[PDB]
Amino acid sequence: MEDLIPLVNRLQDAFSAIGQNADLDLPQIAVVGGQSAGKSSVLENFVGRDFLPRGSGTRRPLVLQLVNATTEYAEFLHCKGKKFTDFEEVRLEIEAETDRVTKGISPVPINLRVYSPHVLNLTLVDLPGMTKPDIEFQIRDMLMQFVTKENCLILAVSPANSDLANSDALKVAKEVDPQGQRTIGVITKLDLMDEGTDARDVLENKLLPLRRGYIGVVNRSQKDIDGKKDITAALAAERKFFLSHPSYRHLADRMGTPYLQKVLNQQLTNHIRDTLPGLRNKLQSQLLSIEKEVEEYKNFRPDDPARKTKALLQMVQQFAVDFEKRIEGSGGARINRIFHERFPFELVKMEFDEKELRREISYAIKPDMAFETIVKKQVKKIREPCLKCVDMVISELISTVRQCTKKQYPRLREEMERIVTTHIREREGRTKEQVMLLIDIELAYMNTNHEDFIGFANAILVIRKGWLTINNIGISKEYWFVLTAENLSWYKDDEEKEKEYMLSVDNLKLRDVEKSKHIFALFNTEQRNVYKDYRQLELACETQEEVDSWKASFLRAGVYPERVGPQLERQVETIRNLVDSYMAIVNKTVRDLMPKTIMHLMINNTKEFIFSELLANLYSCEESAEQAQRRDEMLRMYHALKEALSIIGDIN
Amino acid sequence: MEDLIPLVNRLQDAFSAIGQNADLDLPQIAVVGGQSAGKSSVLENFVGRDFLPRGSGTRRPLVLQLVNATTEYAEFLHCKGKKFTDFEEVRLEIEAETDRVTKGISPVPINLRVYSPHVLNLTLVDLPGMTKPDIEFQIRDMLMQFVTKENCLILAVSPANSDLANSDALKVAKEVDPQGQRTIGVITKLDLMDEGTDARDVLENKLLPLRRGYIGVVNRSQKDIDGKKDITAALAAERKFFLSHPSYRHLADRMGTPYLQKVLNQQLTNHIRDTLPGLRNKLQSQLLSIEKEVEEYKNFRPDDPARKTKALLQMVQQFAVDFEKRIEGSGGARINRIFHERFPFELVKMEFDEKELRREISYAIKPDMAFETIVKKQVKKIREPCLKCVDMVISELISTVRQCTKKQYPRLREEMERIVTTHIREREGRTKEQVMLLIDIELAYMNTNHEDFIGFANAILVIRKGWLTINNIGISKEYWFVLTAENLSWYKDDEEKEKEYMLSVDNLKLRDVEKSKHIFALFNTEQRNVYKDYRQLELACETQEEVDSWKASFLRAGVYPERVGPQLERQVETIRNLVDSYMAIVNKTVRDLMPKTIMHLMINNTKEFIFSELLANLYSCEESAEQAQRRDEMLRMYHALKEALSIIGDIN
């Protein structure tokens, strides 16, 4: 159809206008240059004028458009201006255009066209030929880009002068077109081959044939009085060379520029007719995919404040629900609870027994007054554990906002981080101050009419999993330990499908060993052996934290750490009961009161604040530059692609 | 002894100088005037010159001192100046002196003396005679003052003219001297009695005799050419009247001015000799009693700052120990504890059960969310009970300082009250603010990993005594109830020695009745009868406070107040356990945490403050006018009394 070839030209010109043209699935001829070639002569001959850059140069993907005319001349798309009448100017222009967008390559197409009553109607797409190599590698990926397309035909150009078993043209062609679905194949410089190198078989198409087939041509090196080559001498010479050759006189009808021109035409046309429909579909599909992002744009215009207000309503309001949310969902939900119900370990840790406790009794002696000295100094030691807890909350919390501050804008996310992240720092002080008071309270009264007794009265929940290298089996690899609040067990693979053993949490106690690895062990209070024939189970971990975290996640399982167990014997006899009674109750309080406090201040202060005072603060006081490029690319893709199909017509 | 009579004169003159002279135990003649008299003539005759105020007038206690001389004249103590030579001037002076210190009386003595070769050596103390009566009553108390003294002799002067069975002189004398230890008795105006009224027996001393005896005299009304009476005509007339009388001619040696003068002399002298020793002792004793107050004065001089510094060290430093002291000793020691361990009642009171509790469950329905609604609203109701407690502490505390702010100075005590009393007002705010926070904390978290269970888990100390009118026995008086934390019993008299009954605190519950008397009762949960045959024991009290206080002092004894006791039955089934579990623990906290808090703030704030910041505040920013009078009286008593004994000599 006379409108088939001319049609695809409109696409390229329009799409090429914005340069994203490898990507569009477009039916076109993909000239591939291999080795010495030269592919360019094969082009300059179709017109009868040498315009392509002289020498190897093979510049950038260049879209050549041979549109049959009555007069010889050409004009590029960038100028949109003059019509070149001096083909020598083209060369000068093309080369200039190249360096502007670049030794340098670029997939951006030139998209040139040429009106001439000499050139047969064809559009030839020319790509940089092979060489002989970083440049080369760089080169090849883009070439792969083009041939790889479903609907791109490669006119693999191979010089007969050399071995064809290894031709840059066909070689690369076999990669993207193992058959002859698109590859055609051209044979140049028969004259180069040595007195005997002639190989008709290949034009015969053997070793190996393309569905498209092979064609032969010879570029006359003859020069006119002018520098530019003359058409007849070259043309007539072809029909001469062939007809005056034994193994080619019978192929001459099919050998030469004249045939190749005709071939490429009715071959490129038989392509557009079958494929155009696929294009319509594959083109209309990539359109909606864009409209699915334009609907997100809301108003397709810049810029409206109403949109900013909507952002404030959603950008800064969903973040409110994004929080209670994150808090209650390890995630912040239990990373959080953990610290409240693991905290009691920090207490036990920063507390004492045995002789340290006993020495204090001796100091008190040298009963009620003694009790005050003991506790008033013990409760004083609760500051250490308490203060640490507060800080622990901030960590998992201050970083929590960040776990949902990415879900884009550089101005807004950073602002949100500064406004919230700092607020907690202001309150970490407030709360920490409230903590001291609560403690100082104890050193003030310590009633005994409490539930405690008066002096002289006597006398399936899986706690945590993880790996933990066992220790010193001498015959020592780690295992997937999954201690629960009911029974500890360690398996082999995180799969947990090969249970190694199961120790009864009952009658177990944890004690540190030595103290450059952080090692701790577990021993049974009843059975001389913990597990198997081992006196104690020694578990090693990488850092002190892992230990602290594990032991904390152990007491909650019932595995307390292990504490050894004149008339001074009767004296401390009662005292022992005293310290225990009160300390026991005072502990129950804090382990409950501390968590409660924070929730009011750290949590509620923040929750409340971020809920409404945040937006107000934002009122009181974008790109995505990278993303902005896409929208410009997006905004341009639409305006371009619409013309693509608005021109294709409708099922022709 | 010639120095006996003249001695006591020096005392009076010196002591009289400062007027406190009824009080000093001094040997002297106490002239008492009764009825018509006139006692004064009896005085003017001893000298032979009428100087005493003319007429009845009998002015003020007047100390007359008849010191034998060679020339006639006199001089008072106030003037210290001229020697009166014109006896008419005395009268003018005496009367003037009287009005200055007064119709008006005053125990302040005049202390007059008179040198004359006519007057026999005597010192006569003259007091206002009786009249015929508010003035009179007023008069008598001062007279009693004088006669009452151990060593004061009353020359009861009775006019024979009238009945002696009723004589103001002797009558009043019999009151302070039932015998004749000091009363002497003089008889004047024999001539007044009717032709037969003569009564020798009494001079005979019968009806009745004084150890001292009686004496008779008659005042000549005769007038010289001058107004003043003449001596011979009067004197000679006496020896005449008597010697020329049957029942008196034999008494004439003992009748008349001449004898009375002699009598009074050697009678007043025989007094001073025996008594002076007693005076020395009774005078030296009242001296040291003064020195026991001068040693308290420290430096006997005004004024030194060092003393003020010492006051600051002790006046404002002992008050520090005066406090911990008062706090731990009803007194502040338990008035205090009481409020901390009775407070839990206020909670129970300002809390609810039955349908009020049930209605809330229905609102929650229309489980975890319901639990929050219940508690978050229940803990909210704890503000009421809590706030009241704080105020209760202030009362017993703010008034405590006053319980030891009296132990004198007007400037200092008031300053102390203002400085401390106000400080608490400043802190009652601070603490009250700390209370709200603690509560608001609860409405923030309410962990359930506490010791409570998860949802769906199920499905001799004498507390106080006092009176209390029982109610409506119909046959209703009060009894001395002495409920303990082991057994309640009511007795009859605060003596507690007639126990009426003894109810087992076990199985008892208190419920209010009706609700213009505040009545409440007690009923046994097991036995249909509380005590005796009564269904319930009804105790009435005067004010709501007594009730609130009693019920509070009852729960602590185990006698709680009494609380009645579609598939909604299974729904609230679990909820019931929920509310109870958490509420139970949250209560244990406050009943302990509230007391602890205050001790830190109210108590320790104050204890600390008053201990050191008080004195500093005092630095940063007396009489006892009444007391000042005593010191002036004290300072003068010494300077006077010292001369008293420094003159008496030593055991003469």
**Is the dihedral angle over the CA atoms B495, B499, B500, B504 positive or is it negative?**
positive
CA gap B54, B95 in Å, rounded: 10
Comparing CA positions, the residue from B386, B383, B585, B439 lying closest to residue A591 is B585
3-state helix, strand, coil in chain A (%, to 5): 50, 10, 40
Q: B344 to chain A: nearest residue by CA?
A: A450
Q: Which of B443, B446, B600, B607 to mutate to test the interface with A (most CBs of A within 10 A)?
A: B600
Encoded tokens for A233 = 């001498």
| Phi, psi values for residue A561, rounded to 5° | -75, 165
Query: Which CATH number is correct for A462-562, 3.30.300.30, 2.30.29.30, 3.40.50.720, 1.10.3720.10?
Result: 2.30.29.30
Comparing CA positions, the residue from A118, A98, A119 lying closest to residue A107 is A98
Which helix (H) or strand (E) segment holds residue A523: the answer is strand A518-524
Query: Which residues, in sequence order, are bridge partners of residue B64?
Result: B124
> Which strands make up the sheet holding B464-467, listed edge to edge?
B464-467, B480-483, B488-491, B501-503
DSSP codes joined into one string, B327-373:
HH---HHHHHHHHHHHHHHHHHHTS--HHHHHHHHHHHH--HHHHHH
DSSP codes joined into one string, B11-63:
HHHHHHTTT--SSS---EEEE-B-TT--HHHHHHHHHTS--SPSS----S-EE
> Which strands make up the sheet holding A113-116, listed edge to edge?
A73-75, A113-116, A62-68, A122-126, A28-31, A152-154
Q: Which residues of B touch A608 (CB under 8 A)?
A: none
Q: For chain B, which residues make up each domain, given as ranges?
A: 1-300+623-651, 301-459+566-622, 462-562
Report yes or no: B163 and B199 within 8 Å, Cβ to Cβ. Answer: no
Q: At CA A102, angle to CA A99 and CA A106, rounded to 5?
A: 120
Phi-psi region of B196 (alpha: psi -120 to 50; beta: other; left: phi over 0): left
Query: Does B595 contact A446 at a Cβ distance shorter than 8 Å?
Result: no
Query: Does B588 contact A442 at a Cβ distance shorter than 8 Å?
Result: no
Query: Does B444 contact A592 at a Cβ distance shorter than 8 Å?
Result: no
Residue B501's SS3 state is strand
| Phi, psi values for residue B635, rounded to 5° | -60, -35
Residue A533's SS3 state is coil
State the CATH architecture for B1-300+623-651. Answer: 3-Layer(aba) Sandwich (3.40)
Which CA distances in Å does A64 have to A49, A52, A93, A645, B247?
14, 11, 14, 22, 189
Which of A437, A447, A596 is nearest residue B445 as measured by Cβ atoms? A596
- The single-letter code of the amino acid at B636 is R
Q: Which residues of A touch B597 (CB under 8 A)?
A: 441
CA gap B396, B331 in Å, rounded: 9
Query: Which residues, in sequence order, are bridge partners of residue A115?
Result: A67, A73
Q: A589 to chain B: nearest residue by CA?
A: B589
Report yes or no: B61 and B126 within 8 Å, Cβ to Cβ. Answer: yes
Cis-peptide, bond into residue B57, ω within 30° of zero: no
In the numeric block, the tokens 């139970």 are attached to: B584
Residue A79, judged by CB atoms within 10 A of its CB (0-12, 13-18, 19+), counts as: exposed
Q: B438 to chain A: nearest residue by CA?
A: A597
3-state helix, strand, coil in chain B (%, to 5): 50, 10, 40
- The single-letter code of the amino acid at B608 is E
Residue B254's SS3 state is coil
Comparing CA positions, the residue from A652, A433, A651, A644 lying closest to residue A10 is A644
Comparing CA positions, the residue from B523, B510, B373, B516 lying closest to residue B443 is B373
Report yes or no: A44 and A188 within 8 Å, Cβ to Cβ. Answer: no
Q: Which of A596, A599, A607 to mutate to test the interface with B (most CBs of B within 10 A)?
A: A596
Q: Which of B340, B341, B441, B590 to mutate to test the interface with A (most CBs of A within 10 A)?
A: B441
B41 is in an annotated binding site: yes
CA gap A75, A64 in Å, rounded: 11
Residue B601, judged by CB atoms within 10 A of its CB (0-12, 13-18, 19+), counts as: buried
Comparing CA positions, the residue from A401, A413, A319, A322 lying closest to residue A622 is A413
In the numeric block, the tokens 């006639």 are attached to: B72
Residue A465's SS3 state is strand
Q: Which residues of A are annotated as a binding site for GDP?
A: 36, 38-41, 54-55, 189, 191, 194, 219-220, 222
Q: Which of A555, A592, A597, A607 to mutate to test the interface with B (most CBs of B within 10 A)?
A: A592
Q: For chain A, give me the number of helices (H) and strands (E)?
A: 20, 16
- The single-letter code of the amino acid at A441 is I
Which CA distances in Å does B314 have to A233, B320, B322, B650?
137, 9, 11, 42
Which CA distances in Å does A633 have to A18, A286, A301, A624, B286?
9, 14, 15, 14, 121
Q: Give Cα A151 to chain centroid, integer Å.
A: 30
Query: Does A603 contact B444 at a Cβ distance shorter than 8 Å?
Result: yes
| Phi, psi values for residue B464, rounded to 5° | -170, 140
Which of A441, A589, A604 is nearest residue B589 as measured by Cβ atoms? A589
Query: Does A447 contact B603 at a Cβ distance shorter than 8 Å?
Result: no
Query: Does B445 contact A595 at a Cβ distance shorter than 8 Å?
Result: yes
Q: Which residues of A are annotated as a binding site?
A: 36, 38-41, 54-55, 189, 191, 194, 219-220, 222
Superfamily per CATH, domain A301-459+566-622? Dynamin, middle domain (1.20.120.1240)
Residue A77's SS3 state is coil
Cis-peptide, bond into residue A624, ω within 30° of zero: yes
Comparing CA positions, the residue from B80, B59, B67 lying closest to residue B9 is B67
Which helix (H) or strand (E) segment holds residue A491: the answer is strand A488-491
| CB contact set of A170 (below 8 Å; sequence gap of 6+) | A34, A156, A158, A164, A183, A185
Report yes or no: B483 and B557 within 8 Å, Cβ to Cβ. Answer: yes
- The single-letter code of the amino acid at A428 is E
CA gap A213, A251 in Å, rounded: 13
Which helix (H) or strand (E) segment holds residue A390: the answer is helix A383-398
Residue A143's SS3 state is helix
| CB contact set of A181 (below 8 Å; sequence gap of 6+) | A211
CA atoms within 13 A on the CB side of B375: 29
Comparing CA positions, the residue from B488, B477, B476 lying closest to residue B553 is B488
Residue B136, judged by CB atoms within 10 A of its CB (0-12, 13-18, 19+), counts as: exposed
Phi-psi region of B504 (alpha: psi -120 to 50; beta: other; left: phi over 0): beta
Q: What was the resolution (in A) of this experimentally determined structure?
A: 3.7
CA gap B298, B295 in Å, rounded: 5
**Is the dihedral angle over the CA atoms B619, B625, B631, B635 positive or is it negative?**
positive
Query: For chain A, what's the residue count?
Result: 652
3-state SS, A203-257, equals HCCCCCCCCCCCEEECCCCCCCCCCCCCHHHHHHHHHHHHHCCCCCCCCCCCCCH
Query: Which residues, in sequence order, are bridge partners of residue B73?
Result: B115
Q: Strands, E, within A437-484: which ranges?
A: 464-467, 480-483
Interface of A with B (CB under 8 A): 337, 340-341, 434, 437, 440-447, 449-451, 585, 588-589, 592-593, 595-600, 603-604
Which DSSP category does B521 fall into?
A: E
Query: In B101-199, which residue ranges form alpha helices assigned H by DSSP?
Result: 134-148, 168-176
Encoded tokens for B35 = 């009825």
By what method was this entry solved? X-ray
Q: For chain B, give me the number of helices (H) and strands (E)?
A: 20, 16
> Which strands make up the sheet holding B518-524, listed edge to edge?
B508-512, B518-524, B537-541
CA gap A278, A280 in Å, rounded: 5
Report yes or no: B423 and B601 within 8 Å, Cβ to Cβ. Answer: no
One fold for both B301-459+566-622 and B462-562?
Answer: no
Q: A594 to chain B: nearest residue by CA?
A: B441
